Amino acid sequence: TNGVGYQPYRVVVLSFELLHAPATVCGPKKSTNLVKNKCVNFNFNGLTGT
Amino acid sequence: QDVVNQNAQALNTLVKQLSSNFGAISSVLNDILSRLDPPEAEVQIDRLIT
């Protein structure tokens, strides 16, 4: 009967820290074969770089 | 030996500077680019650039 501002809200929060170690919690990015001796992009567990 | 050591020290300071946040939420461009979008990254990018 009250207003929406007075109705209860099912609330959550997603806390997560960053950049310490290869984690085990991240997205469905599909791996691929490795290749060497060609300067190429990469992304290892989150660590990017070229 | 003096001048060589001095240049070494200067360059070392210069390069080490890179790993400092200067009040930005990171110290890696590509990082912020990954975890942030222009309308909110631009400010951190500005901080770092300055």
Technique of determination: cryo-EM
CA-CA distance, B32 to B25, in Å (whole number)? 8
CA-CA distance, A24 to A45, in Å (whole number)? 9
B43 CB neighbour count, 10 Å cutoff? 13
Residues of chain A found within 8 Å of residue B32, distances taken between Cβ atoms: none
A42 within 8 A of A35, measured Cβ to Cβ: no
Q: Which amino acid is at A2?
A: N
Residues of chain B found within 8 Å of residue A29, distances taken between Cβ atoms: none
CA-CA distance, A21 to B19, in Å (whole number)? 18
